[PDB]
Write a protein that binds this DNA or RNA. Structure first.
Lengths: 148, 51, 156, 53, 185, 222
RNA sequence: GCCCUGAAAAUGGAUGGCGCUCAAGCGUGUUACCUAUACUCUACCGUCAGGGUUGAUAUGAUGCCCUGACGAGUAGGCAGG
RNA sequence: AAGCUCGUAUCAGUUUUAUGAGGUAAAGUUAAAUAUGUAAGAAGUCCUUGUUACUUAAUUGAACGUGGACAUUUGAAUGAAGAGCUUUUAGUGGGCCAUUUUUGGUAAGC
RNA sequence: GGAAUACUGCCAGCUGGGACUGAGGACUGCGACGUAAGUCAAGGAUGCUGGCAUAAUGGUUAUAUGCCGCCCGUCUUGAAACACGGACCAAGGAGUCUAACGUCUAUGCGAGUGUUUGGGUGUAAAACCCAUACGCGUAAUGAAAGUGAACGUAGGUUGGGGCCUCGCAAGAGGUGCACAAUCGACCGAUCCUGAUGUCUUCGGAUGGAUUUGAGUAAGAGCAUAGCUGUUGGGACCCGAAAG
RNA sequence: GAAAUUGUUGAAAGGGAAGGGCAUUUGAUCAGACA
């Protein structure tokens, strides 16, 4: 809506908010990022540290498939159970019956350990795990089956 | 709503300063002074009249 | 609609007026006005005449008589503020005056009561008037200012 | 001054307060009576000009 | 003329009233401008100015933070107040009973609170239950956990995480971010 | 309801006591002033009869007035004037005299005219021009409840107690002197004297310390 | 100390002009008086701050009222029309 | 401009007391005037008995603590349209004059 | 030996004349005066009289008179300038749209969020309904191979709105969200140590460190809309010598 | 069928411009109001 803009408050004033000395002109500081080493340097340093230069190895033909490894902390990992069935497992938690959580079914590539699942034994299928992730699972009374 | 000066308008001067009535009725503005006999000693006058 | 409406309208109630603190209090005349004193009328019908003060009316005006036998000025209300008091008096004590009020003078040819009391009063005045020589001629004459006269200097 | 203030107060705690524990600026000097006896005012006057070169 | 030690005609820089056009919002602003005036207890005066807060200044108070404040000693019987929205936290697998009063609950935090035998309230019913504020806890959510505040005050040696489009190698890790290329910071 | 009737002459009795206590308390401040002005007279007489001299106690209070406009002031005095609350030409307040406040005046002397007020001017200013500072709001006094609801913690329960605390320069002078909004005066009634104000009072201008001659200048400004 | 001399530049010519000599000049003193949008008091407009007021049975809760203080402004910014 | 947490309160183009630094004017090594740093309390003081891998010849220090005690003349004057905090962006980046000092220049509306 | 005037200053001393203002609109308050009833100059003006009902007052406009008043816009330290543009009139005429984002605000839901590439449907470019994915977010860190967040009531200390207890209150105590400071614990990278163990050089336990990160430490983001700002585009409008 | 601009009539004005502000007199006009 142009009825709300401020150049519809600037009608009648000569210079339209751009000042009478410096005026307003086409490109005072060059087009785009020009002068980034030279007259804009003080700007690039402070607010773009690290802009110039090269860090490490190139990678030819990179594909984000190989690198797909979503992560699911032990924070959640009980969300993957149906909330209607879920409270059946929390109460009456024993072995010989334990929930099989397939974390790849839900799109997760690795089970991390961020913290404190409850004391219920649980069977967790995962591609990858972390050293702390199992220690908390395995001490909860469950195990980690690896899959592919 | 409007400020009524004392020092004129006697009625406002009497809500402030309840002593304004017994001040005037006894005068005390014109109150007389006790009379004294003391004279400056001859050293003080000798200094004042000096060269 | 040619104009929509205001959405709250002012009430046509009228508030009464806050009680005012003011009181009618009797005028204190300036010290130059004493009953039975030659006055000089400064404006109006009779401006210039030299007339004799009589009573101070309830409406704050002053009652004067020429006398009408003399300068032709009847009994008439005059405002104390338009009248120069003079330094010469006549003895007014011979006149009743208790019959008058302001109600008497209300407007509501000349009524025969006002012509009777006009003449009744002069019996007392015209007696006292001729006692000082020329004061019959003086109460009949009109005042004026002359070349060289300075009202801030002159005494009245 | 902190220690002295500690002393005076705890001292004045059996003295019934009236501490006056701040520092106050130099006041205007109170009244007095000089005694001219033995000291007579000595009249002085300005002095004329001189070269003295 | 007068010599001013201050700048003239200078507003206080506060919310005298919300910027929202919400109607039901202004009915609480109307209810707590009344109690703040006549009830002499500061609780009402606190909840009033919390109804004027913008969105960014109203972070949500998760249903887990509500359980801490109840573990807080003596507070297990208090009625927690949140001016803001309560949200669900399932990372807690147990929840107390108590009570909550908030503007908006999420559908998850409504179930969880009702699930335990507790109760969800609005602010209006709190005003009727405790006008003065008897036995209440106000709770604020974390303000500086935002994504933008992470960027506030960028500059050398302040560790403020530059505003940037794409994160990874090859985007502003090189000159000035490490000693080997140029300098560091 | 009891209300109107039973709480009137119950309250109206307490009103009677405030001014019955102001009655006795002002009587004591009038006998206090007069016998002090008398003993200063008797002391100069008893001394001259001993052949000696009597030096007055120095003046413990001044009244400062801002004589100069609001602009082209150097920064250091311009900061002082704002610490005495002199915010405009012709305004002023009472200033206690100690070594602290007395080296301030030496900074601002070109910009002010001050002296030693008598009980006369302290009484006119406060009655005529005296205002209070209540939640800011610069209230006119006009009544004894305005002073008692503010300074009553200190005593000072009438407008006769202000004038006392001001002229005796009592303990509470700071609380009381800051309870008075700065006096807004007018220009002098009969003029300033002299063609030019901004010489020092000793060279024939208006500023500086004019001592007891300030009593006459303020009254034309009041 | 005052005055004169030293002291000569170009269209006609400027203590501002007329004109002024026990001054209407010069040095100094006492007073009276004149008048700015500044000062004091009052009314009104707006701005800011601080408070009062939600009870039907009316018409505004961006409302009504109370109290104070304050008001220059280019480049510039904002709010309301 | 948008506000935010708060509201008796830390402040201040100011003095005073206390205490440093200076090497211009004058003086002929000495040393001003004006400006300048810090302090004037609760983040305080005194006692009492805990911690450590540092320190000690050492139950001795250092740093931080527990328990107890001293509140508004709480530690000088005056003042304070409140104190702090953050985000965000306009214009500007040709200056000129007067005063008190001063270099270049013979001087200058330099 | 007495005085009086003068001068200075004070009175909650007396009285007279002139000019200006009349805000507000039931009562409330504080006083004063009265034995009393009441009255009063005490939280802002009333009473009495008169005239014309008129263009009298008042407006509007031309003239005249007194004082004042330089020509506009622009650049400029400085323009009335012997600086530039403008004879006059009417009509057109200049910070827009968009792609990608920062802050701020409102709204829906909220550990999620986004129906509109598409399909169903329809009164037919609308509206209505919806499966799969996908994008941002919930995990950081190293060039990389790679690894990946609780010693503890998710810790301690100082301060903190608010609430609770006591007390007549003043204030002290209990708890303390957000938030600011500060010391720790946790994950990753770099340098150091190097365990029970082993295909005898793999494995990497443990323990460190004035080191380093855009990290954890009971999630806050996603979508649309708006103001302001930026970048690219003809880019607020008009204008080159050229290629 | 606007404005620049023009002809006619009427009114007023005019000593090297014209035009403007404050103030009131004079001339022309205007309601409102009262009653």
């Amino acid at each position: 809506p142009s009825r709300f803009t401020k150049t519809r408050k600037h009608r009648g004033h000569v210079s339209a908010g751009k000042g009478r000395i410096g005026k307003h002109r086409k490109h005072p500081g060059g087009r785009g990022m020009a002068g980034g080493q030279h007259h804009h340097r003080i700007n690039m340093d402070k607010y773009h540290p690290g802009y110039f230069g090269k860090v490490g190895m190139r990678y030819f033909h990179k594909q984000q498939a190989h690198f797909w490894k979503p992560v699911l902390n032990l924070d959640k990992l009980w969300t993957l159970i149906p909330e209607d069935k879920r409270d059946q497992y929390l109460k009456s938690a024993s072995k010989e019956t334990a929930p099989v959580i397939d974390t790849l079914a839900a799109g997760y590539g690795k089970i991390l350990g961020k913290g404190r699942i409850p004391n219920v034994p649980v069977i967790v299928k995962a591609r990858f795990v972390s050293k702390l992730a199992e220690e908390k699972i395995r001490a909860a009374g469950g195990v980690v089956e690896l899959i592919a | 709503v409007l400020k009524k000066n004392p020092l004129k308008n006697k009625q406002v001067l009497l809500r402030l300063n309840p002593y304004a009535k017994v001040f005037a009725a006894e005068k005390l503005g014109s109150k007389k002074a006790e009379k004294t006999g003391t004279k400056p000693a001859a050293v003080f006058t000798e200094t004042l009249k000096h060269d | 609609s040619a104009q929509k409406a205001p959405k709250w309208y002012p009430s046509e109630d009228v508030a009464a007026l806050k009680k005012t603190r003011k009181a009618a209090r009797p005028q204190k005349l300036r010290a130059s006005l004493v009953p039975g004193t030659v006055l000089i009328l400064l404006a109006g019908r009779f401006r210039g005449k030299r007339v004799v003060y009589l009573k101070h009316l309830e409406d704050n005006t002053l009652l004067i008589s020429g006398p009408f036998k003399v300068n032709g000025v009847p009994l008439r209300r005059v405002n104390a503020r338009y009248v120069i008091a003079t330094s010469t008096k006549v003895s007014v004590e011979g006149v009743n005056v208790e019959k008058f009020n302001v109600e008497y003078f209300a407007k509501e040819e000349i009524k025969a009561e006002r012509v009777e009391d006009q003449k009744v009063v002069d019996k007392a005045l015209i007696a006292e008037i001729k006692k000082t020589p020329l004061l019959k001629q003086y109460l009949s004459a009109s005042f004026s200012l002359k070349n060289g006269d300075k009202p801030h200097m002159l005494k009245f | 001054r902190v220690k002295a203030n500690a002393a005076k107060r705890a001292e004045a705690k059996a003295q019934g307060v009236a501490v006056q524990l701040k520092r106050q600026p130099a006041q205007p000097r109170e009244s007095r009576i000089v005694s001219t006896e033995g000291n007579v005012p000595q009249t002085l006057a300005p002095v004329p000009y001189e070269t003295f070169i | 003329g007068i010599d001013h030690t201050s700048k003239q005609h200078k507003r206080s820089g506060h919310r005298t009233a919300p910027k929202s056009d919400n109607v039901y919002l202004k009915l609480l602003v109307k209810l707590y401008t009344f109690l703040a005036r006549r009830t002499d207890a500061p609780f009402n005066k606190v909840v009033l100015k919390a109804l004027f807060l913008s969105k960014i200044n109203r972070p949500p108070v998760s249903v887990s933070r509500i359980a801490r404040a109840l573990k807080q000693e003596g507070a297990a019987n208090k009625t927690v107040v949140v001016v803001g929205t309560v949200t669900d936290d399932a990372r807690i697998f147990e929840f107390p009973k108590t009570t909550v009063a908030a503007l908006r609950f999420t559908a998850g935090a409504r179930a969880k609170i009702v699930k335990a035998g507790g109760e969800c309230i609005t602010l209006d019913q709190l005003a009727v239950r405790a006008p003065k504020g008897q036995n209440t806890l106000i709770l604020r959510g974390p303000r500086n956990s935002r994504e933008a505040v992470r960027h506030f005050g960028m500059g050398p040696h302040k560790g403020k995480a530059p505003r940037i489009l794409s994160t990874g190698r090859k985007f502003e890790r090189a000159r000035g971010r490490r000693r080997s290329k140029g300098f560091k910071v | 309801a009891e209300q109107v009737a039973a709480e009137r002459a119950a309250r109206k009795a307490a009103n009677k006591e405030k001014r019955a206590i102001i009655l006795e308390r002002n009587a004591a401040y009038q006998k206090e002033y007069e016998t002090a002005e008398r003993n200063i007279i008797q002391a100069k007489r008893d001394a001259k009869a001993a052949g000696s001299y009597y030096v007055e106690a120095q003046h413990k209070l001044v009244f400062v007035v801002r004589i100069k406009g609001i602009n082209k002031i150097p920064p250091k005095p311009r900061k002082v004037l704002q610490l005495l609350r002199l915010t405009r030409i012709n305004s002023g307040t009472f200033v206690k005299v100690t070594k602290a406040t007395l080296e301030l005046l030496k900074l601002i002397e070109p910009y002010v005219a001050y002296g030693y007020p008598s009980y006369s001017t302290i009484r006119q200013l406060v009655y005529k021009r005296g205002f209070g500072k209540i939640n800011k709001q610069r209230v006119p006094l006009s009544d004894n409840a305005i002073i008692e609801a503010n300074l009553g913690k200190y005593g000072i329960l009438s407008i006769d107690d202000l004038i006392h605390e001001i002229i005796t320069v009592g303990p509470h002078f700071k609380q009381a002197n800051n309870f008075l909004w700065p006096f807004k005066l007018s220009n002098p009634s009969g003029g300033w004297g002299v063609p030019r104000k901004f010489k020092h009072f000793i060279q024939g201008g208006s500023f500086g310390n004019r001592e007891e001659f300030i009593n006459k200048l303020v009254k034309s400004m009041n």
